[PDB]
Amino acid sequence: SMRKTIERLLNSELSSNSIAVRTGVSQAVISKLRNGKKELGNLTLNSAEKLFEYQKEMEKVDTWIVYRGRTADMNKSYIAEGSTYEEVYNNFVDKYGYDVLDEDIYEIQLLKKNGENLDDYDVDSDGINNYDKLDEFRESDYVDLEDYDYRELFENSSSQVYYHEFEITHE
Amino acid sequence: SMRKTIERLLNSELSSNSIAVRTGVSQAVISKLRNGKKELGNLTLNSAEKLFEYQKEMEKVDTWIVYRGRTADMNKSYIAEGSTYEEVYNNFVDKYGYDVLDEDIYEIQLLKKNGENLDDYDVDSDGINNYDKLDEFRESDYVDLEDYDYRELFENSSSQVYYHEFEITHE
DNA sequence: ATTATGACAAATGTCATAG
DNA sequence: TCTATGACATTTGTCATAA
């Protein structure tokens, strides 16, 4: 899926036969890809999904994300920590508060991801104004936010914190 | 290319031809995928990436910035609009003029990006005392100002407009 | 426990055309 | 506009070789 993560697998010194048995993709494909005989883009979704998921599980333990945010005053700095983007968001909201980020940013991200018209919910600086419509959406079957969406919540928000830097450490 | 995200594009009510035009995937492939004659798993990463990027763009959250500024007296009012801080600044200069904002604030921000000492740079309210240093800066591209620098330009200014306020809506 | 190369049936992407 | 169906050169996935 993420061509970056599968590219990091080719960068890895793990054996092509080890990759072949761990993911299920043949050693032939892995050897030809690293050699340059094959291109990752030309590969199928199923095999690429296998390679990406395996590396993602491997990186799950040695991954730490430190968020940095700067307000207008030099003194105010917002920093959060976690191994997952969602963890960083929860650490931030308990550490600092929901009102630091843009009003109702989580709900707005969820609505747009699910294909809902923002106009119906009366979006404004004051947040979601049509609370009753949001309540109808909460009961309705929806698609829960993925980790990447949580990073977007910080970058999208500029009302209080307009500078966003994330540190990703792979060991 | 998350298969769930691509499926939400194929399960939308959007035309297979329109999806084909915006993404670049052939209408043939998109239609066969929707029919069931082809499978997403068998598709190449490049095309699946194209589909993924368009659905990601559709689900992306929009940002609109309304800037409000006032003089110390509060008799004089200034208002600007843009989806980026750079767009807000460009609108402000087009509507009001470069002189109203702090003199050579754009250059001050550039020097701050370089890290060159402001005191050594002959900093003054009048503007750039040292023309020589300007050509020195012209020699190096250095770092072109990022969007956040444009908000900082407004907040740094004290002369003329002294009250700076940014409101963000994600409609 | 490794690493390159096939062969082969089956798909793909890029173009069309037809309705 | 839009859908469906295909042509063609070409890369795939699987399953092997050989070293």
Residue numbers in the entry:
A (entry chain B), B (entry chain D): 0 to 170
In the authors' words:
AcrIIA15 is an anti-CRISPR (Acr) protein that inhibits Staphylococcus aureus Cas9 (SaCas9). The AcrIIA15 protein, consisting of 170 amino acids, is comprised of two domains: an N-terminal domain (NTD) from residues 1 to 56, which contains a HTH motif resembling a transcriptional repressor, and a C-terminal domain (CTD) from residues 57 to 170. AcrIIA15, by combining the HTH domain and Cas9 inhibitory domain within a single protein, exhibits dual functionality as a bi-functional anti-CRISPR protein capable of both transcriptional repression and CRISPR-based cleavage inhibition. Our structural and biochemical studies demonstrate that AcrIIA15 functions as a dimer to simultaneously inhibit both anti-CRISPR operon transcription and SaCas9-sgRNA DNA recognition.
Based on these findings, we utilized this specific DNA sequence with one base-pair overhangs to form the AcrIIA15-DNA complex for subsequent crystallization experiments. To investigate how AcrIIA15 recognizes promoter DNA in a sequence-specific manner, we determined the crystal structures of the full-length AcrIIA15 or the NTD domain in complex with IR1 DNA at resolutions of 3.15 Å and 3.10 Å, respectively. Resembling a canonical HTH-containing DNA-binding protein, our structural analysis revealed that two AcrIIA15 molecules form a homodimer that binds to a single IR1 dsDNA molecule using its NTD. Each HTH motif of an AcrIIA15 dimer binds to one copy of the IR1 inverted-repeat sequence in a similar manner. The DNA is positioned on the positively-charged surface created by the two HTH domains within the dimer. Importantly, the DNA bound to the AcrIIA15 dimer exhibits a bending angle of approximately 30° compared to typical dsDNA conformations. This observation suggests that the binding of AcrIIA15 induces a conformational change in the DNA, highlighting the specific recognition of the promoter DNA sequence by AcrIIA15. In the AcrIIA15-DNA complex, the HTH motif and the subsequent loop establish extensive interactions with the phosphate backbone of the DNA. Furthermore, EMSA results demonstrated that the R2A mutant exhibited a mild decrease in DNA-binding ability compared to the wildtype, while the L44A and R2A/L44A mutants completely abolished DNA binding. These findings suggest that dimerization is essential for the recognition of dsDNA by AcrIIA15, consistent with the structural observation that the HTH domains of a dimer bind to the inverted-repeat sequence of the DNA.
